[PDB]
Amino acid sequence: KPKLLNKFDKTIKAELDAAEKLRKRGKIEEAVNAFKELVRKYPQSPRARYGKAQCEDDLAEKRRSNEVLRGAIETYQEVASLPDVPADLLKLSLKRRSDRQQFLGHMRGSLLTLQRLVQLFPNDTSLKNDLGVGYLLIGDNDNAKKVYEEVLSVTPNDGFAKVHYGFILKAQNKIAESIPYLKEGIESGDPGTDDGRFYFHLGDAMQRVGNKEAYKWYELGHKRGHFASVWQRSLYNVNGLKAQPWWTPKETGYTELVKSLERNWKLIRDEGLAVMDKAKGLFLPEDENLREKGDWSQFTLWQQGRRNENACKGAPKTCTLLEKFPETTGCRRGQIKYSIMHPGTHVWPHTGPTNCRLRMHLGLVIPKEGCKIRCANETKTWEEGKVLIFDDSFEHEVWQDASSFQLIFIVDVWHPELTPQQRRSLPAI
Amino acid sequence: GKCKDGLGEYTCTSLEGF
Ligand SMILES: O=C(O)CCCCCC(=O)C(=O)O
Ligand SMILES: O=C(O)CCCCCC(=O)C(=O)O
Ligand SMILES: [Cl-]
Ligand SMILES: [Mn+2]
C-alpha cells in the first residue's frame, strides 16, 4: 500500500529489494551490510537510508542494545533530511523515530519529533493525537489539553481524543466534565480507547459524583481483561499473585518485620511526634487528589526502594530499625512513610497502582473513636502498637471523624509470592 | 509525578530502553 520509492529509488528497486529480503529472512548482519553499501553507492536514496535504519532497529532488538537503537534513531532522522522523500516514507520514518525515542525514555526528543510530524502533515489528526500522548508522557498536561482541544474542534467525535481529553479533565479534578468524554470515548471503540486507564478513571469519576453506573464499567473493564476483578483495579500487575483485601502477618510470612514493628512501636511513634512538634513541614500534603475533604500529610522515609537520607535524619532510630528488613526497604513498588490524618477527612475510594506490594499500617496515635478503613467489602479500625495489613490494589476508603489527630506508620512490602528475580527486575513505581 | 498511593498519572513507570 505505502508508496516508499521516489523516482530514482524506483530505478534501483532490485538492489533495494535484495537488501530488504535479507532483513526479512532474519539475516540482520548481512542486511545492515547490504543497506550500508546501498547508502554508500546511493547516498541520497531515502529507501536505502530507511532500510539501514530498520536493520539497525532490528539489530538493537537482537542485541537488546540501547546504543544500537540510538544509531537507528539518528538514521531515521537522516531519512527525513534527504531530497525528494515520498510522504508515506517520511511519515513512517519519523513516526518510528519518535516511538523509539519514547522506548528509550527520550521524551523531550520524542516531543520534538512529533511536533515536526504535525508541522509536516497538518491535516493528519492521528499525528496530533500522538503529539498529545507525547505531552502526557512528560507530564505537560496543559499542552496535552490544548492539543486534544484542537483535535476535537475539527473532529469532535474522535474517540481517542475524547478519552485522552477526559483523562486530562479528570486529573484536573474536573470530575463531572470528564465523565461524558471518557464514556463516549470508550464507547467509540476507536483504536487506542480500549485501555484500562480510561475504564479506571471513568468508574472513579462516577463514584465521586454518586453515579451508580460505576461498577458496570468496572465489570466491563474486568471482562475486557483490564482488571483482575471489579474490586482489584491496579494496572501494573504480576498475574496470579494471591488476591485478598486483608492479610494476617502469618499469611504474609513477614512475621519478623511485624514483630519488630510491634515490639518497637513507641520509638517509631516518638520520632513521628517529634517531627510533628519540631519539624512539621517534613509532612507533605497528600497530592494525588484522593481526598473529598480534610487534611492528610505524609513524611516519607523510603520511596521506590531508595532511602531519603535527609528524612532519616529526622527519624534516625526508625530508619536504623527498618534497614534490617529488605522486604520493605527494597520494595521498589512501595514506600515507608508516616501519615497524619485529621478530623473531617474522607479519602475517596481508590486503588494503588500495583498488585506487587502489600501495605502494612502500624498504629501510633489512634483516637478511640471515629477512625476507620474499608478495604473491598470489609471495614476495620486500627490499634496503637498493632499492625494491620491490606492489599491496597483493592479499592479502599478511609474516614477520620475523631476529635484529634491520627498518626500511623505505613510500611510497604513486596507481595510474598514474588520471586527474588521479579523483585530485582520489576520497574519501580 | 509518581503513583505512590493512586493511579492518577498517565504512566507510572519510567522508560529506560532495554
Ligand atoms: O498536619 C500536620 O500536622 C502535618 C503537616 C503540617 C504542614 C504545615 C501546615 O501548614 C499546618 O500546620 O497545617
Ligand atoms: O494518616 C493517618 O492517620 C491515616 C492514613 C490512612 C491512609 C489509607 C490509605 O489509603 C493507604 O494507606 O493506602
Ligand atoms: Cl544518490
Ligand atoms: Mn490508599
Domain parsing of chain A, residue ranges: 1-122, 246-425
3-state percent helix, strand, coil for chain A, nearest multiple of 5: 55, 15, 30
Q: Which residues of A touch B17 (CB under 8 A)?
A: 66, 69, 103-105
* Contact yes or no for B11 and A352 at CB 8 A: no
The secondary structure of residue A331, as a DSSP letter, is -
CA distance from start to end of chain B: 23
- The answer, yes or no, to whether any atom of ligand 2 lies below 6 A from the CB of A308, is no
Determine if residue A145 is left, alpha or beta; phi over 0 gives left, psi from -120 to 50 gives alpha, anything else beta: alpha
Residue A291: alpha-carbon gap to chain centroid:
21
**Structural contact between residues A272 and A338, judged by C-beta atoms closer than 8 angstroms:** yes
Q: With H, G, I as helix, E, B as strand and everything else as coil, classify residue A248.
A: coil
CATH topology of domain A1-122: 1.25.40
Of residues B3, B6, B16, nearest to A105 (C-beta): B16
Closest by CA position to A195, among listed A156, A164, A169, A240? A164
* Sign of the torsion formed by the C-alpha atoms of B8, A247, A382 and A362: negative
Cα A226 to Cα A45: distance, rounded to the nearest angstrom: 44
Nearest CA to B9 out of A167, A180, A244, A184 is that of A167
Contact flag A167-B10 (C-beta cutoff 8 Å): yes
Q: Nine-digit cell at A315?
A: 527519624
**A406 and A269 Cβ atoms separated by less than 8 Å:** no
Out of 2.60.260.20, 2.60.120.330, 3.40.50.300, 3.40.50.620, which CATH number does the structure's domain A246-425 have? Answer: 2.60.120.330
Q: Is A340 in the pocket of ligand 1 (CB under 6 A)?
A: yes
Residues 1-18 of B with CB under 8 A from A: 1-18
- Chain A residues whose beta carbon lies within 8 Å of the beta carbon of residue B15: 102-105, 107, 137
Structure-determination approach: X-ray
Going from the Cα of A219 to the center of ligand 4, the distance in angstroms, rounded, reads 21
Alpha helices in A64-195 (DSSP H): 66-81, 87-103, 107-120, 125-137, 141-154, 159-171, 175-188
Phi, psi (deg, nearest 5) at residue A384: -60, 130
**3-state secondary structure at position A199:** helix
Resolution value (Å, 1 decimal): 1.7
Give the other-Cβ count within 10 Å of A369's Cβ: 10
Contacts of A239 (CB under 8 A, 6+ apart): A228
Which chain A residues have a beta carbon less than 8 Å from that of B9?
Answer: 139
Q: Which of A303, A373, A411, A429 to mutate to test the pocket of ligand 2 (most atoms within 8 A of CB)?
A: A373
Q: Which helix (H) or strand (E) holds A387?
A: strand A387-390
Is there a contact between A340 and A276 (Cβ–Cβ < 8 Å)?
Answer: yes
Whether A285 and A309 have beta carbons less than 8 Å apart is answered as no
Name residue A19's amino acid.
A
Q: What separation in Å is there between the alpha carbon of A141 and the centre of ligand 2?
A: 27
**Site to substitute for ligand 2 among A204, A341, A364, A365, most atoms within 8 A of C-beta:** A341
Number of the ligand 2 atom closest to the C-alpha atom of A373: 8
Provide the grid cell at A379: 471495614
Q: Which residues contact A225 (CB under 8 A, 6 or more apart)?
A: none
Q: Name every residue whose Cβ is closer than 8 Å to that of residue A10 and which is 6 or more positions away in sequence.
A: none
Instruction: Tell me the three cell numbers of residue A227.
Output: 482488571
Q: What values do phi and psi take at A8, rounded to 5?
A: -70, -40
Residue among A376, A398, A417 nearest A229 (CA): A376
* Nearby residues of A37 by Cβ (< 8 Å), 6 or more positions away: none
Residue A277: Cβ-neighbour burial (10 angstroms; 0-12, 13-18, 19+): exposed
Q: How far is CA A319 from CA A300, A360, B5, in A?
A: 11, 16, 21
